[PDB]
Amino acid sequence: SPGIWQLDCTHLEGKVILVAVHVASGYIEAEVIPAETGQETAYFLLKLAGRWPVKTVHTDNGSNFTSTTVKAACWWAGIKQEDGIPYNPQSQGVIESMNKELKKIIGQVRDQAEHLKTAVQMAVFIHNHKRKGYSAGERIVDIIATDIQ
Amino acid sequence: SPGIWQLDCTHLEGKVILVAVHVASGYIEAEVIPAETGQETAYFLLKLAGRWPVKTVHTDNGSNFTSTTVKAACWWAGIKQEDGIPYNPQSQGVIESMNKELKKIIGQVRDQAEHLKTAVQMAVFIHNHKRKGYSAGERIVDIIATDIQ
């Protein structure tokens, strides 16, 4: 579980927000792209795997699962690419509830930035620092450090 | 020291690579931008502080130290913005040797990517995963986890 991430793609303002969630902690990373393509997804995964120890990724749809650019980045970065088929049925609503929470945060900071991408990074910041009692940013560091030790 | 980062800016292929180094571990994050501006610097710091607990940033020059967009992002994200004056003189050479190493990594992967930004992210990955036998990615997670507890 310490190396498992789920990809998630949601829309806002006619743009796409790509999200990776660290499943055990709830910690997220996200970026605004003009559209989800294999290339953007591959590049986002290379960034993430250079920052955290990403062992397995549950892809968000079957086009990214199939994409040869995505499989090439997974290969390069050492990542097991898996489907994201929610065999535990809890998954669909969990992803939906996160997207709803993210967009709520985004609407709360929205007026503080001209560009969507700034608002999205503010929301990532607020989501990861929120105490729930540790934050997601705390949990992921504790999970992975425990795993190393 | 677990919340201190140093910003660093280096050039390659007529482009700018902005780097943030976690001083205690050597772990880095980097991005390619067309030019260093306050706005780009501010946005890079907002991204970094949503991912790691950034308490203190030593800015890479006095224009970013002065930049009101940069000070606004530091304020938003709770970061103490400091100068990067190497009061310890070993600082200049250490930053230079890191730039040289990053650029060596980059030339080793350069072939494998059309765009500079991809090669930069491959180099961030290789740099953070290198053992020499803990890696930088391991050290930063141990340092910060030790600090939470």
Ligand SMILES: O=C(O)c1c(CN2C(=O)Cc3ccc(Cl)cc32)ccc2c1OCO2
């Ligand atoms: O805040 C969140 O990110 C969040 C999440 C995030 N999350 C976790 O905490 C663990 C987890 C596993 C898988 C996925 Cl896909 C999301 C999450 C789930 C449900 C929610 C959320 O907000 C409201 O309902």
Ligand SMILES: O=C(O)c1c(CN2C(=O)Cc3ccc(Cl)cc32)ccc2c1OCO2
């Ligand atoms: O590989 C690196 O990142 C590296 C570094 C990085 N580094 C550390 O390990 C600790 C540290 C504090 C401050 C700075 Cl500014 C860089 C570093 C320093 C010197 C080097 C390097 O490569 C060769 O010489």
